[model samples]
Target chain A: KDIRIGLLGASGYTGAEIVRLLANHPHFQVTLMTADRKAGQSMESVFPHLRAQKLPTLVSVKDADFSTVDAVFCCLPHGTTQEIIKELPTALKIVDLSADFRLRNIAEYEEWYGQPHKAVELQKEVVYGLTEILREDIKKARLVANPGCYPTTIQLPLVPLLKANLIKHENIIIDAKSGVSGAGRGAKEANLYSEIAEGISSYGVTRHRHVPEIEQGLSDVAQSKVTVSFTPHLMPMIRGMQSTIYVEMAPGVRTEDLHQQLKTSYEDEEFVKVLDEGVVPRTHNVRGSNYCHMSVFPDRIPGRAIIISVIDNLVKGASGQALQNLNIMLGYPETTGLLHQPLFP
Target chain B: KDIRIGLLGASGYTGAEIVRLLANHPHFQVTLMTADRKAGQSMESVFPHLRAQKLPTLVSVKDADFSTVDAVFCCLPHGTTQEIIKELPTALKIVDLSADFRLRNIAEYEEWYGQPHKAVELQKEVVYGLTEILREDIKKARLVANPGCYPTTIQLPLVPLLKANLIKHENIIIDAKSGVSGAGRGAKEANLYSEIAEGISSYGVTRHRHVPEIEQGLSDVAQSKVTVSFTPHLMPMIRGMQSTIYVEMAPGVRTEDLHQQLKTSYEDEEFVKVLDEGVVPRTHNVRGSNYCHMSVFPDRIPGRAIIISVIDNLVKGASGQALQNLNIMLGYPETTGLLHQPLFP
Candidate 1:
């Protein structure tokens, strides 16, 4: 009775995280795994930490069979995912861990990602999988575009405040920091251990691809076009993301108003938390879990507030989110197999 | 000739940190170390990381002879430091790394520390050594009471803003997180690796001893009795401290105005840095050095601002700060033996 799952790109970081998360999943079984270059290898041979779990060996996507898969977690590269997902059987439910189908505007996607979106028609059917915000849409959709890590961290805290009209849509500035694992399992000279071990540096300032996705989500919620000055940095550690968001409050809105709105918005949600007043959200507190911990603070500048949000970039940010979307899309309980407590340092 | 330094309670974390820092000093030498319980042990035996440096063996404070010592770094516990400093040779300039002589009011100190002032007279002569803010006083003083780790982290960023009158003195909320080592090397059920690691919890919320110390420093700059909502939490890591401060900006002041004031305040100082506009300050960026990294952000609430400041809790927050004060008091270049780059990753 378990849902048969297929994972593409099993050699990558997010792919490994999906396998790790699915290992304990009660209703989902990873029935197929594909890694073009790492084909014909055991999951343990590629990611030793996953050796304890029984999983299918990696095969090239070209040779994969979709007949037995009830759902597929497409963890392939951004540009390559669209065409592959397009070819999957109609009966298969898909949760994409790529940027391919996230942005609704094909032209905007082309502008940011530097490549024309290949499967334009499929984009129309994909729901922006910010699970808590688009639960209804995600539950009915056959395919969901799981949001980018930065966008997920940015939107989860901002959407409710924006929807409630508690904070202004303009002048929203997000300064986010993420662990190195976000760069993926690629062996880049820039991501070398020596280069990232003890220092933090900012990259993808004004032109990051996540900008469009984040604005798209916020704009949809606020019912107006919203743009943010988002800056993302690479942290020295290996698994978390913290977005220190700065927002301007609407006239007469106090810090407590924004905090209360967030608490009321996600009160029934199992994974998203708005911490008690004055408590800070540290990446260490939510490490290795599907939880998003956030807090709002009164700023020294009148009419402005600072919000701190944290999540394990590999979890709520990527694979964990992908799995959550799949659970909802398949009519399984949204919290299924995603209830592991956060691993702290 | 090098200044011969005597370190009291050399078996403690701060004591080992002082020895680690003095290893490269050009004009200061650790000639005597006192640790009653750890007496006769080599510095390496107590702290293996300090094995690279040549240092004196531990001795009891009673057995220490300060005849050849030029100055002393008293790292004893708070309640025990005053009496020991009182008996040390007056000619030996001293920096007491304890709370015993930090507060100017003995009555207030007694109330918080739960002990009667043993050396009340010595308090008058002890300068509150927040080096950057009280440099002139530190340079001329023979006895200085180094600031607490939390107080030092709070004051460095707030002092400049408070002195500039860019922020209000009321409703200042500080949500601070510090590494486990800040709890000191003492063995307790609470500080065990298992209890303190992975998760973070707030302690000393409304009534931490550092609240008075922080208020004293801020009040001194504001020229008013300023009370702050200071909350401190124990972090999962072991060497950094971050104080995320929320303040109400004075009438008509912008976030940039606060940022500019900090930039100009510490522009000429080597140890303190105000990051470029929009750049965040992470503890990893300033780890292992005396440097303090800080930045200002505009909050959603009009007339409110959020300021973030980070420092190595062991370095700038404790031992490195003591060394900075001693260098000023001794008239050595303030940067001597303290120019090591931060360790990242």
Candidate 2:
């Protein structure tokens, strides 16, 4: 019942979040974890907030003994993950929180990403995760490329509505906003406290790399080529993502139709909560939980609906979703260490 | 000849900005200033960043003798200003930066503000003091009701567009975000460093009083009813307002035509700059000057134009504009003390 888990990239918020969640997990054990740039230092040195916790000694990913670990959770940066993951022992199960293995079409991934994806063979076999919807496929996947923060936030609202034909596919606009932590644990001026503290700005407009992955996930169900106008902005907060989606509801489709679709879609599911009509979802409400809160309303224009969806980008979006896949893969309950209400203090 | 001016609200960023700009102002002398909350304190004591400058002792507004000053700049809270200004002799030529007399409709003001408009009859004749657009009125009036920061940034762009009939009315959505200091010089737990440093949430969503004032301004120009979905979100920065206006351009109106209209409209205006096509206005650009940098883009949707505008909510938006109004009233050039080319460090 006990399994040794190693986190290959333990420097980012998602990585630190994994540590926070794993500290309370009942059975799975963390044997080896990397703290990257602060290698050979204590986790307390890199993240002063975690100074009170008992954690493994920080080491570079290169120094970690992957042979003894039963499973590896690779939270490395996008480009670096593919090659490093491909060379890992084929027998070792991996849940990568990078874009490297997310897209199934290797050339499309290279096209959107502006470079060749290093893991072409592994890309062919990796599951199109959305673990709640694709639970069966993910359990059988030896490698799972976790979804991006924005993609996971947007796709939760779109997939059920798109599958039910309640909303149109072409030229949907997703006005997505996320906190600064999504910029990653990189040391850059844009991510600095002074620059980001009281500022909100739009960085990636029409051509953000997340657009293609979002399209791939939705199109697979829509069975059509999808084009979404994805606009992402950096909020001043440290975490959360809200997808303010504008989609034209087809004739005979009302907000009621979408609400019912959402209600039925996640009725038996433990985490995703379909909010009642007129109940808007704030990032604060779902913060630090595996829950994805969604609601739909009619826009001012007839046949157009304003659908809002929210998720904790670090948790349900990336690492939490990965752990959901990990639980399914290991035959544990999907919500195994991922339950409990959001931390609102 | 140099004129001496003192600030009553010298502790806020807007006040710091006023001092920062006037420190270099060739004609104005900053003789004596006061911050009631910081009474008997130095400017360095209030703002650790300004430790070098020798400034006057801070005193309560009640204690600062009015007869010695040529003109007084009262940046204190709203209800506190009426009695303070009423006691000051009429020779002062006041430019009140509070919501003391902006509205003509008292019941409507009372409905939104929950208090009877205190300075009742003075509301009728108080100059609507937006410096660039309302220069003639500002020049003649003794007491200028310095418009709220939001009203200033918005009226500049939309008033012209509304007057020209380029965009339709009744369905306008003013999705605006302002830097934190707009909430003002209050020591509330909500506006504390921990609450706002890295988070964003919309307050006054439907209950904001600015909605009525903004509509009244637009309705004045358009000669028709104007209802706006005025929702404001707090940004993480200490200054500036970015309004992403969603409007449906009238039939046969192209994006290029709207851009041309905007350029031709503000071409002669010194403080208003139209950014080149494809360039968005960063709040950083207008961080500390009385400049409204704006750009318009056509949505991929037909008949919809996204008019994005940004301004230093404290400057072109507040006291900088107030000083500009003061300059206009005093027969100085409109940009006499306001053109410092935005502090972007």
Candidate 3:
């Protein structure tokens, strides 16, 4: 039987990406779509690229009934999602692509987001969905909080290294860059095509909200307090991410040692790959697909190594990663409806 | 008096960018345009974004008359440009945006670009046009070799630093990324929107043609042998270039020293900017105009620093720099017809 899916916040980039990915999904049927501002508009009107997909007409979330769908993908903005997801039917499994439920501590979330947690009760029930790392927990969770693009790119590589104790926690610097879409598809002056088409800029220097989320994950793996100098830049591209991470290896460890640890960790996983020793992984190699390409390089300075990781910000970083979690929650193959080869130049 | 310009290969990305820049240019008028494949087509028919401009119809290079123009902007591909520029009158100021005349040595040019030099004689008179650095030479040359996009992003920052001897020569690595449009508007499966929209991949890793061009400029500034691990990646974006350069600092030199030197070097120039301390430069900040945003950050490893430089590959990196050179050759203010603020988010 097909699983009818309800997509909240259907007008934005992530929602559109989910709709595009679900078009070929064998078991998932998008039967309900809610776009607060774009209600009454067709999906084609909002995104011409997804014109071929016969998506449901956009409606208000209040009008979308939970009885018609087996699952809901919440792509609403941060503050709004927790409350809405709280009201969602308990039986319908939910995957949220927002900052609402990813953090475990309500105080930490409030501190970074600058808001009191509206659904602190539901936050306790939400499983932080990093997919590869949180697979077993995600399989049985009714509510999953999808990781942010920066956190996803960082944790995917760092978690393995930290877990194996191959790299030291101190002095980790992540120079992460992402396509403008990671800023979201809101109709803001900053997101305009002309404003962002020909440049790159770093915003939220050391205080990006993703910093806490990433630190939370890394700290858990290292089993200690882990702080990093994380700087995220906006690339002019529509969809992609590259995190150029600088880290100090544990005494006597080299880039090769870090590479082997990553390879061994993700070797059994389908979506992530630790590329060959010398090959640098680019975000292009995983565009439009649910995959992360990562490699470690020896820095000019000994004991320091550079880890390069790339992903399609909208796919592996957002909606496609959401789909991967959704498949696991529903007992479908982990790669189900998410195995398209990256679009390459 | 307005300088009448003839644009060769006007169907490609660089030609369109030149036209776009020329539309607002007060002292230059495009009197003729040549695009062998797109001959007989209107500029609007070729690119709708340029529909506002009153541009001349595309003509074959054979049909374009040198008598109608004061200067020619040769945007033809590598192998074809030398022959076309050779046929042009010597008195005509020509800025060739190709690799044909970039390398002073024919052997190095032939080795990198798989073709033997067809017009080695014209290559001698060509001054490698890096705009700001080669201003005096550009003013006297009738033919200028505009720097490639990759070299422009790499050289703009490295040149000033090398000249000051603030950074070490050994272990200089440039992980450069550029929008797909840098590959030009050629019709290939690779350049298709579907192929490149959501991904990035490194091409011509250590063997990119721009390697020699970048080394030539850096070596000239350093006055010594210089080899860099230059890697170029095709970003999924339509336009922009970011060269994330990793350099080992000379003993006792900090990132602040590199910053001040870059600031001092380009203080009188209009296009390049050395951002404030701790401000990471992004490609988005320099999107449309002829501008390059660069910054230096203290690397996590001691005695090292990370330099980020960005440009609208088609603008400051190509057409914008060409216009700057053209302004110099014509005895106008260096910033004349090129002083637009970058389109920033």
Candidate 4:
């Protein structure tokens, strides 16, 4: 039988992005969609782009009949998701696309968020949602936390090095640039079409909330504390993430030695592809899909490695990553409903 | 007499952009043009966008005679700009669109750039070419450093706040975002049109060179040390910057008070505009012009404010701002060759 999925917060960019992909999904049905502000309107009316799809009528999340939904994907804001997920039935297979379940230590969460953790009790039960490394754990979990856009781009390349212990923990510098849709489908002036149509700038110098989450993922992989100089740059495009990662290789390691290192780790993984030498991972190569484009380069520093990675952020970074975990949790084909070529001009 | 503008780096986006604008300029002539890579190619062949403009034939920087040019507009890269400016005829006013002279402290420039300042002795001699505040300085100076795209948006609004002490210096958080054209016409795979068509992300977190430059501007206004949490983001577009600034004001500081403060500061300035209440700066409103759109909002936190500012990185941010300085340098109307309206979809 085809699986039916419930979509909460389906009116936003990340949410609409799900429908954009799932419309072509073979075995999945998008049965219900929720948007409080856009409730009772047709999905087509809101995003004219979705006029051709057979989507659900927009409704408030509170009114959605969870019983009709076999699995649920909640894309609500951070604090709100923790409470909303708690009230849902325990048996309902839930995947959260919020920061509620990302942190292992609640203190770090509370500190960066400037609030006490409302979901500390549930944070302990949720998985970290790196689809490749955490695949097995996600396969058996009831609730999976969708990773942030920044964390997904960072963790994909670093986890393998940390697993091999070939790189030091302190030697991480992420100079990443992303396109605009990752800002979400908000009406804020910053994300306006005109404001971002032709220009580019940088923001969130040090205190960006994602820095700790990135460090947390790296620390988990290295089995030691990892503090990185993580910098995220905004590009003037709709979608794509290019992460130029700088790492300190263990002494005497050549570029090819590390290339073999990453290849050996993700070679057989379906969605993860280790590109050939000099073919850097660009957002263009993997848009609208659950694929990751990655490569490692030799840096001028004798002991340092430069690794580059790219993702759609909305796909691999947000909802599609969530769906990958959901597929594993339900024992479906790992690539089920997630394999499509990037949308290119 | 027409204003004679000499362009140093005429091959890049900003250089081609100046050519694009000057094609329609009423009282300006692009006399001397230089490009190292395509030194002999027509500007039309290099950038097909300007096939119509019968621009001056490209030549090596060595070939251009500096004596005939009234003002030299240097669009070369950062380090290259200083030496070129130093060699230029001192009688010609030079507006440098490079980072060589934006910062006041030579030590800070050394720290961020990781190199000794070549023209350290002349650092104090160049004025920060913001145009609105330094028009008189630009009119008489031998050399002027164009403020960066990020610095222009952040400085335009915060200068008033810092001057009035309307906002606290410590909690100055500038969460800014920009489009792709800011990276220039480079061949990096990360900035390929397909790699960068869609997505929103943040970069240059704490270590962006522009950070100290912006902080330095704000610090100079306050006459004290000012540390800011300046985070920049990338959008999926071709040309603009919108800086969403978050700052703290003393108690009883109403939104209207901040509004009046911005209004009074920009009321007389031609390039800087305090957008009306409820309307914030969208890059579209000032798209291809040397105009800075700004407005202030009272955040939910009492005595805290959310200030919105936008500028076309190429115009208000770079070349257009450069022209504004040139107008002052040539003793023309402040708006001469710089009064471009927005180009909307």
Interface RMSD of each: 6.6, 3.7, 4.5, 9.1
The DockQ-based CAPRI class assigned to model 3 is acceptable
Q: Return the top candidate by lDDT.
A: 1
Is 1 or 4 the stronger prediction by lDDT?
1
How many clashes does the backbone of model 1 have? 34
Classified by CAPRI criteria, candidate 4 counts as incorrect
How much is B287 displaced in model 4, in angstroms?
A: 1.4
Q: Clash pairs of candidate 3?
A: A198-B287, A199-B283, A199-B284, A200-B282, A200-B283, A200-B284, A201-B282, A283-B200, A284-B199, A284-B200
Residue pairs with colliding backbones in model 2 are: A198-B236, A198-B237, A199-B237, A236-B198, A237-B198
lDDT (10s digit) by residue, model 2, range A1-345:
297888988888888878777776777777788867788988887778887677789888777778878888888876788888888887788888888887888788888877898877777888766887788889998888888889988888889889999998864766677887788888798678767655566666446889788889899889998877666778867778887777778778888898899899988888888888876667777778888888777664557677777888788987788888888887888888988587664
| Fnat of each candidate | 0.07, 0.17, 0.51, 0.28
RMSD of each: 5.4, 5.2, 6.7, 8.8
Chain A accuracy of model 4 expressed as TM-score: 0.96
- Candidate 2, TM-score vs. the true structure? 0.78
lDDT of 4: 0.78
Evaluate model 3 with DockQ and give the value.
0.26
Model 4, span B1-345: residue lDDT tens: 376778898989889878877777777788889997888878888888887777788889887787877888889987787777877888888888888788878888888888878787777889999878767777888888988999998988888777887777865656676777898888898687655655554556444779888888888999997877565655667777888776778556677878898898789887888877765456767777788888776553345666778888888898888877877777777787777777764
lDDT of 3 by residue, B18-63 (tens): 8888887888999899988879999888898998788878899877
Candidate 3, residue A312: CA error in Å? 5.2
Q: DockQ of every model listed?
A: 0.12, 0.20, 0.26, 0.15
Model 1 deviation from native, Cα RMSD in Å = 5.4
Q: Which model, 1 or 4, shows the larger DockQ?
A: 4
lDDT of 1 at A36: 90
Query: Model 1 in CAPRI terms: which quality?
Result: incorrect
Tell me what TM-score chain A of model 3 achieves: 0.97
